C-alpha cells in the first residue's frame, strides 16, 4: 500500500513508458499542425516542461500576470476523431515488438482507462519482497503509536541493500518520540545534512527514477527538507534546555543566498537571545549594549528575509515583540 | 565588509549586439544597437575552509 523505497526496474514498465510517451508526442505534434491552420521519445517530451523541485506540483498563483483568456473552442467528436487516427496509424510498427499485454495496455490508455496493477505487486524478487513487507509495518506502527516495535522495524529496514532516503529521515520521529534511551533524534538529522547535502545544479534533462527532488534531495535553489528540519528542531531543542551561540555561529557559516526561510531562523536565533538576555535579574555596562546588537541583528536579518523570494513573516507582530524587548532595555 | 562595499564601485559591464531587430525603417532603426547585458556582481562571500569528497 505505502510507497516503497525501491529502484525497481522492469522492461515491461519501461517499454510501456517508452510506448506511451511516443504516442503523446505524435498526437501533440499533430495538435501543432492543426492549431496553426485553424532520440528517446521521453527526453523529448519533458523539454516542454519545468519541474518544480521545491514542491511536488508547480503551484502557479493566480494574482499576477499569469491571467489567461478562455478558449471557448470546445472539443466535439469531429475534432477528436481524426486528430487521434493518424497518430494511431503511425504507431503501428513498434506495437508488435511489445508484449501481448503492452499493446492491450496501450489501447486501454489510448481511450482513458487508468490502470490498476501497480509496480509494487508483481516484482517477485524476495529482496524487494521483504522491503514491501517491512515498509508497511513501519508506517503502521508509527501510525499505531507503537515506538519500540517501529524502532526495531526501522533498524532492520535500513540494513537491506536497495533502500533509499525515503524511509530514512521522514519517520525519524522514532528517536524524537522515544526519549527514553534515546540518541536524541537530532544526531540523525546531522547525519543527513552532512553526507547528502550537495550544491549541484538541478540538471532536469535526465529522467529521474527512485530519487525525487521535493522531499529528499538538496540541490542549489532548493534547500533540503531535512536541512531546514535540522534548523528548526535544533532551535526548539535549544530553547528547551532552559547553546544558542553554538547554532548562531553554525547558521552563520552557510551562505544560503537564495532561500528566505533560513534567514528568518537566523533572525530567530538572535530573537531568542534578546528575550533571554533581557531579564538582567537586578531587582550595567556591557549587557545593555550587547542586546543592542541582538535587536539590530533581528532587524537586519528579517529585512533580508523580505529581500529574498516568497516567504512572508508577521513582521508587524515581531516589532511588537521587539519593542516589548526594548521596554526592559530603556 | 570591504569586499561587498567594493563590488559596487566597479558596478556594470555593458555591451550590445551587432544584430538588428529590423524594426521600423527609421532613425530609431539606426538608434538601435540590440539588447544589452549589464553583467554585475553584487555580493562576494568567503567560506571558511571545508573539504569535499
Residue A69 contacts B, CB cutoff 8 Å: no
**Per the structure block, which three cell numbers stand in for A290?**
550587547
Q: What phi, psi does A216 have (nearest 5°)? A: -140, -10
Which segments of A74-211 does DSSP mark as H helices, in order?
77-80, 85-89, 102-109, 128-143, 147-157, 165-170, 173-176, 186-195
3-state secondary structure of A138: helix
**Per the structure block, which three cell numbers stand in for A153?**
522495524
Q: How deeply is B6 buried, as exposed, middle or buried, from its count of CB atoms within 10 A (0-12, 13-18, 19+)?
A: exposed
**Contact check, Cβ <8 Å, B43/A253:** no
Query: Cα(A2)–Cα(A137) distance, rounded to whole angstroms?
Result: 10
Q: What phi, psi does A297 have (nearest 5°)? A: -75, -35
**Contact check, Cβ <8 Å, B45/A255:** yes
A257: chain B residues, CB-CB within 8 Å:
43, 45
A263: chain B residues, CB-CB within 8 Å:
none
CB count in 10 Å sphere of residue A7: 11
A253: chain B residues, CB-CB within 8 Å:
47-48
Residues 221-280 of A with CB under 8 A from B: 253, 255, 257
For residue A50, give every residue at least 6 positions away whose Cβ sits within 8 Å of its Cβ, in sequence order, or none.
A58, A204
**Per the structure block, which three cell numbers stand in for A198?**
550537495
CA distance readout (Å), A32 to A2, A77, A83, A181, A233:
40, 19, 11, 64, 51
Q: Which value, to the nearest 10 degrees, does the dihedral of the CA atoms of residues A241, A245, A247, A248 take?
A: 130
Q: Report the gap between the CA of A142 and the closest CA in chain B (Å).
A: 35
Nearest chain A residue to B43 by CA distance is A257
Nearest chain A residue to B48 by CA distance is A253
Q: Report the gap between the CA of A306 and the closest CA in chain B (Å).
A: 17
B43: chain A residues, CB-CB within 8 Å:
257
**HSE (side-chain half, CA atoms, 13 Å) at A295:** 20
Q: What phi, psi does B39 have (nearest 5°)? A: -60, 125
B42: chain A residues, CB-CB within 8 Å:
none
Nearest chain A residue to B45 by CA distance is A255
**Contact check, Cβ <8 Å, A255/B48:** no
Nearest chain A residue to B52 by CA distance is A198
B47: chain A residues, CB-CB within 8 Å:
253, 255
Query: Cα(B50)–Cα(A247) distance, rounded to whole angstroms?
Result: 18
**Contact check, Cβ <8 Å, B47/A257:** no
Residue B48 contacts A, CB cutoff 8 Å: yes
CA distance readout (Å), A183 to A139, A141, A160, A226:
21, 20, 22, 17
Amino acid at each position: 500500500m505505502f510507497e516503497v523505497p525501491i529502484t525497481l526496474t522492469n522492461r515491461k514498465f519501461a517499454q510501456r513508458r517508452k510506448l506511451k510517451y511516443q504516442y503523446i508526442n505524435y498526437i501533440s505534434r499533430r495538435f501543432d499542425r492543426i492549431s496553426k491552420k485553424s532520440s528517446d521519445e521521453e527526453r523529448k517530451f519533458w523539454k516542454k516542461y519545468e519541474k518544480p523541485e521545491k514542491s511536488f506540483e508547480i503551484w502557479r498563483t493566480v494574482s499576477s500576470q499569469n491571467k489567461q483568456p478562455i478558449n471557448k473552442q470546445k472539443m466535439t467528436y469531429h475534432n477528436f476523431k481524426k486528430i487521434e487516427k493518424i497518430p494511431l496509424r503511425k504507431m503501428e510498427i513498434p506495437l508488435l515488438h511489445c508484449t501481448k499485454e503492452n499493446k492491450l495496455y496501450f489501447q486501454s490508455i489510448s481511450r482513458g482507462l487508468e490502470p490498476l496493477k501497480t509496480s509494487t505487486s508483481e516484482v517477485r524478487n524476495y529482496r524487494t519482497r521483504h522491503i514491501v513487507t517491512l515498509t508497511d509495518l513501519l508506517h503502521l506502527n508509527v501510525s499505531r503509536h507503537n515506538w519500540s516495535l517501529a524502532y526495531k522495524i526501522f533498524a532492520t529496514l535500513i540494513r537491506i541493500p536497495g533502500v533509499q532516503i525515503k524511509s530514512l529521515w521522514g519517520i525519524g520521529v522514532e528517536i524524537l518520540d522515544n526519549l527514553s534511551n534515546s540518541s536524541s533524534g537530532l544526531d540523525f538529522l546531522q547525519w543527513m545534512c552532512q553526507i547528502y547535502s550537495s550544491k549541484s545544479r538541478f540538471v532536469q534533462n535526465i529522467n529521474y527514477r527512485s530519487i525525487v527532488p521535493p522531499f529528499q534531495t538538496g540541490s542549489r535553489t532548493h534547500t533540503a527538507k531535512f536541512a531546514i528540519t535540522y534548523l528548526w528542531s535544533s532551535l526548539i531543542n535549544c530553547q528547551k534546555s532552559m547553546l544558542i551561540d553554538k547554532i548562531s555561529e553554525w547558521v552563520l557559516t552557510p551562505p544560503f543566498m537564495e532561500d528566505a526561510e533560513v534567514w528568518f531562523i537566523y533572525a530567530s536565533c538572535h530573537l531568542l537571545k534578546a528575550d533571554t538576555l533581557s531579564r538582567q535579574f537586578v531587582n550595567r555596562d556591557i549587557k545593555i549594549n550587547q542586546v543592542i546588537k541582538h535587536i539590530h541583528y533581528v532587524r537586519t536579518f528579517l529585512k533580508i528575509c523580505l529581500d529574498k523570494g516568497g516567504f512572508a513573516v508577521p513582521s508587524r507582530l515581531i516589532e511588537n515583540q521587539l519593542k516589548s524587548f526594548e521596554s526592559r532595555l530603556y | 565588509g570591504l569586499l561587498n562595499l567594493g563590488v559596487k564601485d566597479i558596478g556594470e559591464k555593458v555591451i550590445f549586439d551587432g544584430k538588428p531587430l529590423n524594426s521600423e525603417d527609421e532613425i530609431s532603426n539606426s538608434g538601435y544597437l540590440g539588447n544589452k547585458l549589464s553583467v554585475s556582481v553584487e555580493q562576494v562571500s568567503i567560506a571558511k575552509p571545508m573539504s569535499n569528497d
